[PDB]
Design a protein around this ligand. Sequence first.
Ligand SMILES: CCCCCCCC(=O)OC[C@H](COP(=O)(O)O[C@@H]1[C@H](O)[C@H](O)[C@@H](OP(=O)(O)O)[C@H](OP(=O)(O)O)[C@H]1O)OC(=O)CCCCCCC
Ligand SMILES: CCCCCCCC(=O)OC[C@H](COP(=O)(O)O[C@@H]1[C@H](O)[C@H](O)[C@@H](OP(=O)(O)O)[C@H](OP(=O)(O)O)[C@H]1O)OC(=O)CCCCCCC
Ligand SMILES: CC(C)CCC[C@@H](C)[C@H]1CC[C@H]2[C@@H]3CC=C4C[C@@H](O)CC[C@]4(C)[C@H]3CC[C@]12C
Ligand SMILES: *[C@@H]1O[C@H](CO)[C@@H](O)[C@H](O)[C@H]1NC(C)=O
Lengths: 40, 359, 182
Amino acid sequence: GERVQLAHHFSEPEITLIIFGVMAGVIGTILLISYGIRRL
Amino acid sequence: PLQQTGQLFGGLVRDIRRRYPYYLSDITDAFSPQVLAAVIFIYFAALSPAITFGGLLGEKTRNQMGVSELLISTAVQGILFALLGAQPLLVVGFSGPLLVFEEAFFSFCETNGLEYIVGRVWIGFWLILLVVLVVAFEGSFLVRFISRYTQEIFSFLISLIFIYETFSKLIKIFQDHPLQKTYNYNVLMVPKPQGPLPNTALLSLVLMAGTFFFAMMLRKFKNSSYFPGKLRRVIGDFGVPISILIMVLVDFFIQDTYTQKLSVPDGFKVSNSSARGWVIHPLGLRSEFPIWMMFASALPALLVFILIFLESQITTLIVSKPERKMVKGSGFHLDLLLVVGMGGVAALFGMPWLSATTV
Amino acid sequence: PLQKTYNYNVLMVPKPQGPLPNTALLSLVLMAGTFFFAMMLRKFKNSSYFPGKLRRVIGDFGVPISILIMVLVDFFIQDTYTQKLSVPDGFKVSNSSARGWVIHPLGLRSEFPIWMMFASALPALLVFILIFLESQITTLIVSKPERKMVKGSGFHLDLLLVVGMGGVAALFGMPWLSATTV
Ligand SMILES: CCCCCCCC(=O)OC[C@H](COP(=O)(O)O[C@@H]1[C@H](O)[C@H](O)[C@@H](OP(=O)(O)O)[C@H](OP(=O)(O)O)[C@H]1O)OC(=O)CCCCCCC
Ligand SMILES: CCCCCCCC(=O)OC[C@H](COP(=O)(O)O[C@@H]1[C@H](O)[C@H](O)[C@@H](OP(=O)(O)O)[C@H](OP(=O)(O)O)[C@H]1O)OC(=O)CCCCCCC
Ligand SMILES: CC(C)CCC[C@@H](C)[C@H]1CC[C@H]2[C@@H]3CC=C4C[C@@H](O)CC[C@]4(C)[C@H]3CC[C@]12C
Ligand SMILES: *[C@@H]1O[C@H](CO)[C@@H](O)[C@H](O)[C@H]1NC(C)=O
């Protein structure tokens, strides 16, 4: 980045991949729940 | 196009199958001077508000987001929306309500001692999830309930706001350089004049009036019965570039008098290097980001999504009316998804989110 | 002219001896505004807005309304100087030393030459030609049948009156006139 930044355990690509994976999991769970309804 | 199919992501696929077959025509139909004239028109009509909004945002947010970041975000989002969008006629850029929300969020973060740019990153992260959920359930079918009533009211209000701001900028210019009997001839000019200057406000008024008069006269000449028809249409299409060139040349030969010009950053760099870089860490730049704010950013993200959704969908309704002879179709779901996704991605890089501006 | 710097100490009586800021630009703005308001009110006369009687009343008074509006606009701008109308203080001759109200045909300071009295016919012929052409062409223009003139025009009477009034005013040291076209 720029100047001095606080060190983190997860790097920026790592943390953004983790966030995208969590978001994709939430989206998949919501889609599966919606697919469950309107059928039974 | 506003019907509810009942299938997951059905609206997106319908918009894709409606628009992408016309992709080959979308390149060949631009072989006309009217397209080039429209390019010249929209270049200024999008650059000048972008420069003004970037300057105001840099002043209000301590240059955390400024002119350069806004210009880069506008360029990237416009390129992606032109390459992949369903209604390329829409112009993607910053707007006033977005500036108000940015100021409010900056004030909130300053009061609570939170990193505002990381808060924007989390807001964009929530925006991506919100738009994916909306597109998945075909949430853009509710736009069919917006009749001509609301569309025309919004368009008239936005036009009145635009005209009022245009006149208020001239009023502010007149206030900065009032008409006085005497002036100080030794006034520093860098970066801006610190005192009133002679002939500034009057020349600005003259240039604005001349630009408006030439634009209106050339628009009338487009519909007039003078000159051969082909040359008449060529001149009428390039009426705005011709007026801009004429007034710029007129101001150019007046060397002594000072008029405010366009200001752009020297290079492609962040507005404030100390505050942030090109990539902003979602976990925090200077201090560790609080856990609670990551979940609390949804409500500001909800407000941003509501603003962008209403603006883009009403603009698409206005530009895709059947009376305007739109014979290619418009995709609401694809355009909304692309706009909000590009905003969320640009939030990660410390760039402002945009919307389909009406004007 | 438009200059970066101006002298703030310039004498104004009788006229400004040096350039002044915001003068020419404000004059251009006032002229453009007057022309724009006059044209807009002329179009409003023929427009379909407002009740017809009030529309015609406003359209007829379009020039006075524009003049009043621009005069009021310039009035509230106290600091900037604009050139105004100048009229003499009273009903008096411009130069008292040169002549009075009645000029003696035999001479004021020196005896008038005899030959010039007969030689003045050719300048009088040129003046008569100028006034005749101007007045008669103006009468032709204003009395065209396509202009719906249903009262008639008299060329001989108007020409006689104009040239006679000019000749009489020449005696009192006043300029001769003509029927101007504009
Ligand atoms: C610098 C220009 C060239 C100078 C050289 C001077 C020599 C010169 O310019 O004559 C060529 C040409 C005459 O050809 P012509 O009169 O047939 O051209 C018609 C004209 O273009 C109309 O505008 C067209 O109608 P519209 O618009 O489509 O509805 C019409 O097409 P259509 O609909 O009837 O089928 C055309 O036929 O000029 C003019 O256009 C007349 C205006 C000349 C004005 C004076 C020139 C400015
Ligand atoms: C301040 C004005 C009064 C405010 C009070 C508001 C109350 C109010 O103003 O209504 C009275 C009057 C309605 O009466 P009305 O419509 O019958 O008046 C007709 C109108 O004057 C036309 O201009 C005339 O045609 P033209 O010109 O001669 O060819 C026509 O005469 P004719 O040829 O058919 O025989 C007239 O009949 O108003 C209007 O004129 C409509 C425009 C209102 C516009 C809104 C008012 C500006
Ligand atoms: C809406 C999208 C962004 C997903 C919803 C956000 C929530 C559920 C997730 C996404 C990313 C997550 C964070 C990812 C990484 C860490 C670092 C770890 O040491 C503590 C938890 C913490 C801080 C997580 C907290 C919960 C979190 C913020
Ligand atoms: C950049 O941010 C710092 C605080 O981190 C601030 O003091 C400075 O004024 C900012 N730069 C500009 C140009 O405002």
